[PDB]
Design a protein around this nucleic acid. Structure first.
Ligand SMILES: [Mg+2]
Ligand SMILES: [Mg+2]
Ligand SMILES: [Mg+2]
Ligand SMILES: [Mg+2]
Ligand SMILES: [Mg+2]
Ligand SMILES: [Mg+2]
Ligand SMILES: [Mg+2]
Ligand SMILES: [Mg+2]
Ligand SMILES: [Mg+2]
Ligand SMILES: [Mg+2]
Ligand SMILES: [Mg+2]
Ligand SMILES: [Mg+2]
Ligand SMILES: [Mg+2]
Ligand SMILES: [Mg+2]
Ligand SMILES: [Mg+2]
Ligand SMILES: [Mg+2]
Ligand SMILES: [Mg+2]
Ligand SMILES: [Mg+2]
Ligand SMILES: [Mg+2]
Ligand SMILES: [Mg+2]
Ligand SMILES: [Mg+2]
Ligand SMILES: [Mg+2]
Ligand SMILES: [Mg+2]
Ligand SMILES: [Mg+2]
Ligand SMILES: [Mg+2]
Ligand SMILES: [Mg+2]
Ligand SMILES: [Mg+2]
Ligand SMILES: [Mg+2]
Lengths: 136, 94, 116, 58, 75
RNA sequence: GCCUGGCGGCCGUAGCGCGGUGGUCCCACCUGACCCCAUGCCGAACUCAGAAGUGAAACGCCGUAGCGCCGAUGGUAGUGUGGGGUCUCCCCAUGCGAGAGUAGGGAACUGCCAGGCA
RNA sequence: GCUCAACGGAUAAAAGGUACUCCGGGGAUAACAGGCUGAUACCGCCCAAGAGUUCAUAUCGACGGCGGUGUUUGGCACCUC
RNA sequence: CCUCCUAAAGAGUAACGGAGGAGCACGAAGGUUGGCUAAUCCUGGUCGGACAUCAGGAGGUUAGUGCAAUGGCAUAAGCCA
RNA sequence: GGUUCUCCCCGAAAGCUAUUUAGGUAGCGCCUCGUGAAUUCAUCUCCGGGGGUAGAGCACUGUUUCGGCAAGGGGGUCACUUACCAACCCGAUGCAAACUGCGAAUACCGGAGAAUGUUAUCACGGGAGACACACGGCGGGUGCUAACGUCCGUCGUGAAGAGGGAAACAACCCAGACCGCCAGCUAAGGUCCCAAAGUCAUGGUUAAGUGGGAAACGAUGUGGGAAGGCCCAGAC
């Protein structure tokens, strides 16, 4: 379950998630899974989609994950009042914008790849779309 | 084979460019040589279908504006972030 | 780095003479020759100069590049300076110590009536 | 000057303070108030600030 | 463990470009020489630039470092 | 007019790099060091007295786009005002409009004084 | 000459209990209930790894995903002191 | 009390918001003159280890600043007398 | 808690600092009255400025995936190798409130100039009130980008604002009520009846009362578009 090895600071501001993505083209494989929607991808979600990818394809090809959950999210536990300091880190998310390639794959045919990503996409909270490598 | 039938842009920038992509045309630009740059608007689906082929980004291409057949190469292409559309093409002369 | 070392060694005094708006009597020294210019506060125009690489004062010297050649250049540039009307200058050693050839040149210009 | 005609078309109630001072510099006091102003870039630029709420006859 | 802060120092530029200052007028309050002192500008102990002459504030980039300098041009 | 040196402007289209090139002069190394002065050891540096030697090093000039640097047009992003929506985000009208990048440029330019060959 | 550090420093000099309690007040501020919210909870669904002798989907449904209810624990402090 | 962020490119700007410091030190660690310029790695070298000291090279401040952090600092504000 | 006749003009604040202070008070801010005085003030245009935010980017600070070029450790041999590991560097891919080799729009300071505005400005003085704010938009912290939640900034409204609209609805949309009128034009919003005004015109869409509450996902619903494979060597 992906997570930064070390971070400069423990807790990050909520921030906002505006704009189109960077990492919009397939860069390492022949095929990829691209986000259409916007929203946070948690580390558990990324591992589950990856688990479903690597099983739809059995020791076949190579898989890349283009997103990293580097943003720490906090939660006050149950029955704590408001304030008294910021909560504790519970999970890690990657902020996702419309356009972001999330995973890439080669070494398999397209049709197996359309099926692998469809199963992975069911694990994610964001609309996605299949995409192919483009020349120039 | 690739013969793009283009028109010249009368107004430029963001409003004008968005107005085009809402009308199934997209902006583009021709540069290179010592001629000045030439801003063209293309029909989207026409160019969309042709750049699906592989020999669009490798062979010489020709763009007709005002009757004049201008030969070019595809140089850079701005794709939509999350759709199979086109925002902008850079054509270099050759 | 012997060249650059001197230029960096001269910067503070030089930059300080800019801000004080003072015409500075610059000195350049080589193992052979010695030089002197009276440079205006803009730093971009000479008023008066003298040097041992000439003939008007190099035939009168055993060897250009000694304390007595310096004195000649020092006494020379002050005389040229006092004709043009130039009396108050600031000495710029330009990263050479104020010890021998430079001190000779500067000590002579003092006697010849340059205020520093 | 060519003495252009500016009429106030909308209320100044909820508008920004800069907009309200633009109206004052044009002399516009109420909806329908037509003023006569010398046509200059300065005058043309005040109109552009509050163009949403003024119509101009030339 | 994270509830402390310092009072704010009100640093920065006090007189902008072309602004006619009297001698003594502070021009920049700064931590360090973010701006350096030029003609008729003094650099104080806290590195604040102040005018030595009455005149007009002039910002300029000069030198081989492209450092930012402030000077007073007498009007 | 060409070469050199000093002082500046300008502060990388000015820099690094690479290949070539120059010694009348100037500049550099260089020769020597009782005395001037000097090394927290060293005449290496600083420094003084010099002028056999060399342009090897350096420096300067010339060349070469490997690099750095500069850099459009166009589009993209953002945004002031107004308006609107499916309102955690967006769109419309208008105005402003990047950054990155692409084509492309690019082996600085210029002044004062001095000296030297012509 | 003051960790007058509760740092614009009440006095040189100061801890508690009150269910034996009392007054002034507050819905400016808790406890009950209502209200907003729905993290939690409950209920449902999407993907289906697999279990199910074979067989994903009779039955169950890992990793994860989306909602519904106002329904538990709570959050808030808008009503009522 | 100081520093950064929050803080929306002038200043200022809140939370039992996020992160760290101070309650000193110094007659030199101050003044001035003069001089010098780091870290790190590479190559080679007695005891030498992966790292002491020496020499060169690449590097160019990726160091250093009496103590936090920020902004500064080569004309050094950094090292030496 | 309550504080008793009338009309006319102006008209806040619920902020900062400090307080055994936090529902009190004081100075400042904001109100008013008076006096005095400079294009003093505001808007737009032009000019002069500084930025380091948005966005972007990844040289730096850190963080991240892949690939390439490869020292160095360590299971064993008892130096050879090693299915493990491997930094620096190179190429590619991203992320950042406390990263910036880039960098706006806006806002702010200043100057000039015109129109414009009942001096709108500043100063001194007389009198104050106020220092519980609220919702909405924008930008944010906090919380769950939960709360009619909480804390800042900024604007607007309510507070202290009636009228019309949003069924009803302080804070939203329109719009600022001196009085009177059985006159007229419009705003938002609306025009079949309750209920003032189109059962308006042209072209289409929908068949679900969708409209007139709700997501992932599901599906020969239906409209439109771009192409394209098979097709009278006979296809579905
Ligand atoms: Mg726009
Ligand atoms: Mg106290
Ligand atoms: Mg106190
Ligand atoms: Mg007290
Ligand atoms: Mg009892
Ligand atoms: Mg009682
Ligand atoms: Mg209450
Ligand atoms: Mg409250
Ligand atoms: Mg009740
Ligand atoms: Mg009660
Ligand atoms: Mg600020
Ligand atoms: Mg601001
Ligand atoms: Mg009034
Ligand atoms: Mg207070
Ligand atoms: Mg008063
Ligand atoms: Mg950003
Ligand atoms: Mg980086
Ligand atoms: Mg109070
Ligand atoms: Mg209060
Ligand atoms: Mg408030
Ligand atoms: Mg509230
Ligand atoms: Mg009240
Ligand atoms: Mg009503
Ligand atoms: Mg009517
Ligand atoms: Mg209507
Ligand atoms: Mg009717
Ligand atoms: Mg009809
Ligand atoms: Mg319905």
């Amino acid at each position: 379950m992906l997570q930064p090895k070390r971070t400069k600071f423990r807790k990050m501001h909520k921030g906002r998630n505006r704009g189109l993505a960077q990492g919009t083209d397939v860069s390492f494989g022949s095929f990829g899974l691209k986000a259409v929607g916007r929203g946070r991808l948690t580390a558990r979600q990324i591992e589950a989609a990856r688990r479903a990818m690597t099983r739809a394809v059995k020791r076949q090809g190579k898989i890349w994950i283009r997103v990293f959950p580097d943003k720490p999210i906090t939660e006050k536990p149950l029955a704590v009042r408001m304030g008294k300091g910021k909560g504790n880190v519970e999970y890690w998310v990657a902020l996702i914008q419309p356009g972001k390639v999330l995973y890439e794959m080669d070494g398999v045919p397209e049709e197996l790849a359309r099926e692998a990503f469809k199963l992975a996409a069911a694990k994610l909270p964001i609309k996605t779309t299949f995409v192919t490598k483009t020349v120039m | 084979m690739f013969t793009i039938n283009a028109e010249v842009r009368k107004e430029q920038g963001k409003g004008a460019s968005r107005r085009l992509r809402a009308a199934n045309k997209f902006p583009a630009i021709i540069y290179g040589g010592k001629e000045a740059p030439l801003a063209i608007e293309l029909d989207h689906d026409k160019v969309m279908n042709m750049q699906a082929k592989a020999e669009f980004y490798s062979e010489v291409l020709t763009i007709v504006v005002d009757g004049k057949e201008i030969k070019v190469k595809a140089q850079d292409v701005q794709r939509h972030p999350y759709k199979p559309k086109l925002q902008h093409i850079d054509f270099v002369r050759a | 780095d012997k060249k650059s070392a001197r230029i960096r060694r001269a910067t503070r005094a030089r930059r300080k003479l800019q801000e004080l708006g003072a015409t500075r009597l610059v000195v350049h020294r080589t193992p052979r020759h010695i030089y002197a210019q009276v440079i205006a506060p803009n730093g971009s125009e000479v008023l008066v100069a003298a040097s041992t690489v000439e003939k008007a004062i190099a035939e009168q010297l055993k060897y250009t590049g000694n304390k007595d050649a310096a004195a000649a250049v020092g006494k020379a540039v002050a005389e040229r300076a006092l004709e043009k009307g130039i009396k108050d200058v600031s000495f710029d050693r330009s990263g050479f110590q104020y010890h021998g050839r430079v001190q000779a040149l500067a000590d002579a210009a003092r006697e010849a009536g340059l205020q520093f | 000057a060519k003495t252009i005609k500016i009429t106030q078309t909308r209320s100044a109630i909820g508008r920004l303070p800069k907009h309200k001072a633009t109206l004052l510099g044009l002399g516009l006091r109420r909806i329908g108030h037509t003023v006569e102003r010398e046509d200059t870039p300065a005058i043309r630029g005040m109109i552009n600030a509050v163009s949403f709420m003024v119509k101009v006859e030339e | 463990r994270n509830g402390r802060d310092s009072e704010a120092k009100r640093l920065g530029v006090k007189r902008f470009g072309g602004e006619s200052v009297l001698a003594g007028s502070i021009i920049v309050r700064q931590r360090g020489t973010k701006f350096h002192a030029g003609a008729n500008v003094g650099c104080g102990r806290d590195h604040t630039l102040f005018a030595k002459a009455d005149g007009k504030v002039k910002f300029e980039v000069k030198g081989p470092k492209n450092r930012k300098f402030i000077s007073i041009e007498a009007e």
